[PDB]
Amino acid sequence: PGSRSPKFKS
Amino acid sequence: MSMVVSGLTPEEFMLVYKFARKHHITLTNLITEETTHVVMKTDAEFVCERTLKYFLGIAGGKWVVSYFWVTQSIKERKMLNEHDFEVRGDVVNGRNHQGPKRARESQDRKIFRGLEICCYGPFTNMPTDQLEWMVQLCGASVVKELSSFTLGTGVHPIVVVQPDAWTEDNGFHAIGQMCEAPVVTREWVLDSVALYQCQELDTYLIPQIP
């Protein structure tokens, strides 16, 4: 489920 | 000492609060200039995903360490050394690039030294002021508008854009008509920060129409 933080994919 | 966490569930976050309180470490929700540690969720090989906290921790030369530092210290009933849990890489830029360590050891030679950057146009998932903070931590100055570049001998200008955030507006192809600086995607910044190595612009240039 992780966090609500956005990830920056390639 | 002051820490943030990144990629943790609410339950993991509440465990870190107890750990930090026990060891007299401040825990905050957002990164600050006073943050000393960024605790990243990683796989067992210390590879994380790229979040804003990851970038800002590297850009600041802070300790960017795996959450295993917390859980293993607890298991062993001893505060373990951060250098043994330092994040080795990320899923985008590579599993063992060691950007975090490089940044921690290279603040006398910042990757964006001598650059003036305009973070231009709309951005998703990372507000303009946070991208601006990132590049300033890495030695760049920032300008708000294209007409505000210095165009002098002591700095080099760069325009940073996220084309997908413009949707149906192709104006990001027309920046060269208004401005002499090279125009690159936001990935130029993000890749350079994660690796703590200033990348060549070649693969990031946005085609400009005459």
How is this structure best described in words?
The complex is a heterodimer of chains A (10) and B (210). In chain A, 0% of the residues lie in helices and 0% in strands. Chain A is mostly loops. The N and C termini of chain A lie far apart (21 Å). Chain A has no helices and no strands. With 210 residues, chain B is α/β, with parallel strands linked by helices. Chain B folds into 2 domains: 2-105, Rossmann fold (3-Layer(aba) Sandwich); 115-204, BRCT domain (Rossmann fold, 3-Layer(aba) Sandwich). In chain B, 27% of the residues lie in helices and 17% in strands. Chain B contains 6 helices and 10 strands. Chain B has helices at 10-22, 52-59, 68-76, 99-105, 128-137, 186-195; strands at 2-6, 26-27, 37-40, 47-48, 63-66, 89-90, 115-119, 141-143, 156-161, 183-185. Chain B has a 4-stranded parallel sheet with strand order 2-1-3-5, with helices on both faces. In chain B, helix 5 links the parallel strand 7 and strand 8. In chain B, helix 2 packs parallel to helix 5. Chain B is elongated, with a radius of gyration of 19 Å. Chains A and B meet through loops of A and helix 2 of B. Chain B: It comes from Homo sapiens (Human). Chain B: Residues 1-87, 107-206 form the BRCT domain. Chain B: This is Breast cancer type 1 susceptibility protein.
Quick summary:
The complex is a heterodimer of chains A (10) and B (210). With 10 residues, chain A is low in regular secondary structure.
